[PDB]
Design a protein around this ligand. Structure first.
Ligand code: THP
Ligand code: CA
Length: 129
């Protein structure tokens, strides 16, 4: 996979952001994760984590996987990086997202995320408390 520059417009919640992509404003959904909704326990924390991580970064990048780039709802599907650090992985490592929605063909970073999840579970951190 390769990274490319991202033009973010705003973070929406823990696992969705609004991005201009090829000149179209789109919602993008983070691959391989599930954060709580904004009004569920740890929802506000997951939203604030993703929001600060993308806003404080000098450089945001997006990385598509090998399979579909859009979901059935018209959302973009990608991994995001903020100054080189994967947002998808950071959320899982902090126990603010579960590994989820693992589809064959868009699963390149599955093992990396399951490693993070296991560390968060061992630490009984946030969602795993
Ligand atoms: C992460 C992801 C979600 N989705 C779909 C599955 C769920 O659809 P259904 O609602 O039809 O079950 C929905 C979950 O998104 P949210 O977690 O944002 O609600 O988005 C994909 O199709 N591909 C993906 O890679
Ligand atoms: Ca969610």
């Amino acid at each position: 996979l390769h990274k490319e520059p991202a033009t973010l417009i705003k973070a929406i919640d823990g696992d969705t952001v609004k991005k201009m992509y090829k000149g179209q404003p789109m919602t993008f959904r983070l691959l391989l994760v599930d954060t709580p909704e904004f009004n569920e326990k740890y929802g506000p924390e997951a939203s604030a984590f993703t929001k600060k991580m993308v806003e404080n970064a000098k450089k945001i990048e997006v990385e598509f996987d090998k399979g579909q780039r859009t979901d059935k709802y018209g959302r973009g599907l990608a991994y995001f990086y903020a100054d080189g650090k994967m947002v998808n992985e950071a959320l899982v490592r902090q126990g603010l997202a579960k590994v989820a929605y693992v589809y064959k063909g868009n699963n390149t970073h599955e093992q990396l995320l399951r490693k993070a999840e296991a560390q968060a579970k061992k630490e009984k951190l946030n969602i795993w408390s």
